[PDB]
Amino acid sequence: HMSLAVEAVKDFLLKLQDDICEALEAEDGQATFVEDKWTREGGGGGRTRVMVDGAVIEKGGVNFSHVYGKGLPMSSTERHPDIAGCNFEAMGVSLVIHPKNPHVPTSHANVRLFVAEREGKEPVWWFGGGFDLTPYYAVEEDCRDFHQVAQDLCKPFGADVYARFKGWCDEYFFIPYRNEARGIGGLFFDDLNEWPFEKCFEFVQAVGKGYMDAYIPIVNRRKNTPYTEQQVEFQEFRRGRYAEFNLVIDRGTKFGLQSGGRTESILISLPPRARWGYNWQPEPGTPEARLTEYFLTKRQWV
Amino acid sequence: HHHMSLAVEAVKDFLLKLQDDICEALEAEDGQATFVEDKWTREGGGGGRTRVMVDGAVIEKGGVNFSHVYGKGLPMSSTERHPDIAGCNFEAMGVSLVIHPKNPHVPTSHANVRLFVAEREGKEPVWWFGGGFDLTPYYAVEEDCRDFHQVAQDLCKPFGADVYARFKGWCDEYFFIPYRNEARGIGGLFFDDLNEWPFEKCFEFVQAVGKGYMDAYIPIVNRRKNTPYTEQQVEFQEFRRGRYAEFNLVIDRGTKFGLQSGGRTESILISLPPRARWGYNWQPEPGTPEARLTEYFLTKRQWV
């Protein structure tokens, strides 16, 4: 058993939630996170923290969950049939921030660990997570800085780590039926267990710290940018794209909702307001159009 | 097959006229806006006519779509429920619609009628109809829910004593968000894989369903479109429309299939509301008309 290693990860995740919430609270200055602690029948629980109608953060969720189960959920059995009857623990922090000001990107981050106990064997385990940026009115320098933080944090772990997980991020956060990226990318990884546990753990700690290092300066730099009602309208249409990805494509969301996860904790990712229009597109030659024409297709920031 | 080709053309003719007639009826209720048609053609065979109405006096966003697609071999996503006909020449045709009114006191509604045919060398063709209609109120009214279901029960009657019961039941089962333990609306009719009766009887049934949609919904639009409403009631409507988006994007099979099989995205997603809201743990206030939607109307499931 890995009881002590798992306790260390848990303590890290709880502190990460506290630290991210404190940093976002400092940027907003008006609103504070409200905590909703919950439990599930013989299945652990979580601590969901939400901020609404701040000066800066319109809707933000930073969730901690720690789930237990005897046997995997049915939806897990097609990907992991060998351990379908295993006792398991899953723990992680997941967050999505939707700013009031269209000039501040939406962002997402996740760090998680899965451990499955095996009869007469060492447990199976892996980490997952990453972070990513979803601008509306993107800025070249911000996209570069965001990716530079991501690259720099990977450097101590291997020469190809950023390249691999940046690429994975581009592949994962993509809406195939619209031929459109969700955002300008970042890092994405799953099934991470190729390194010794401690190295994997140090890496996810680097990712967690990296989220704040990547996103908080952008929030500080853009939150006071002047904006218009028309820019909010664009933001809301763009948020329709975000809702689509999470509801149609995202594996974590789909799995959570299929397997009896806590709905309101899972769907914190959804925007406060979204618009959909038949054949809606931004007008050509505008900053609005440049998001999809340039920023989402560049896929090379450092 | 000769008889099938002939029959299939009769179905297409019915569907095209159904689209025209539904659009006409809705334009008449609105009085301000009209449907704009977007004709499109599919790479591989066929195409459709997507008709959309926006920012009318009554209809905020409405789509009434016709499609007729055909080709050699089914899409890859069809090869799981129907692997034996994966290499068949096929045709699929239907009318699908979702209407999102401006006024919260007029329910959203949806309807569909469709036919799938796959021809088999040396064997009789495989075919089935699908469709139905359903009502998604915000500020529901007892009489409207009863009337809506009465139209459904009445149209089903001559087809058999258990037809309304089966397809009303199926509607309740299908249009349900299990992770919220919540119905999408007050129900109606839903059916699929309909080929138990002779083709002619199935076709007459879908004709009755198509007509029934207008008989069920148009009187409700007329009766409610002029109800006074507030910005707060629009706010409620928009939060409720988050539920509608969730069903279509997470649960609905047709939507999922279209998006994963190379369907026309903007035609498929006309179902989505013009504006939706989501809030953490959002629920309406207790003891309000807003709360009565989920507390009474969505759980009653016995209207006639």
Swiss-Prot record, chain B:
Alphabetical list of InterPro entries matching this protein: Coprogen_oxidase_aer, Coprogen_oxidase_aer_sf, Coprogen_oxidase_CS
EC number(s) stated in the UniProt entry for this protein: 1.3.3.3
Residues annotated as binding substrate: 96, 112-114, 262-264
Protein name, per record: Oxygen-dependent coproporphyrinogen-III oxidase
Keyword Cell membrane attached: no
GO molecular function, one term: coproporphyrinogen oxidase activity
Active-site residues from the entry: 110
Catalyzed chemical reaction(s): coproporphyrinogen III + O2 + 2 H(+) = protoporphyrinogen IX + 2 CO2 + 2 H2O
One GO process term, biological-process aspect: protoporphyrinogen IX biosynthetic process
Pathway: Porphyrin-containing compound metabolism; protoporphyrin-IX biosynthesis; protoporphyrinogen-IX from coproporphyrinogen-III (O2 route): step 1/1
Role noted for this protein: Involved in the heme biosynthesis. Catalyzes the aerobic oxidative decarboxylation of propionate groups of rings A and B of coproporphyrinogen-III to yield the vinyl groups in protoporphyrinogen-IX.
Presence of the UniProt keyword Membrane in the record: no
